[PDB]
């Protein structure tokens, strides 16, 4: 309903982060 | 310097994401 | 009971991003 | 550059946090 989609979005964003560590470092 | 302290925070959000993963599952 | 516990955390986020936009320009 | 960049991704993730509240709420 809404529990499985907002789970997706944090690991988006979780990964988007780690990508962004990668780019600077 | 800049870098490393925009690093490390990045880090620091990613880690709370990873923890809300877990508390909302 | 985790409703509002996920929606503080998730505007503390929003917050810690604005500053380090601040932080950044 | 690389700082408008980080800006702007920063800016991006800031805006979906902002749209996960409403979606929770």
New interface residues.
């Given amino acids: 309903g809404?529990?499985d989609?907002x789970?997706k979005?944090x690991?988006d964003x979780?990964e988007?982060?780690?990508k962004?560590?990668k780019?600077?470092?």
């Fill in positions: 809404n529990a989609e789970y979005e690991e979780q988007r982060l780690r962004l560590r780019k600077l470092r």
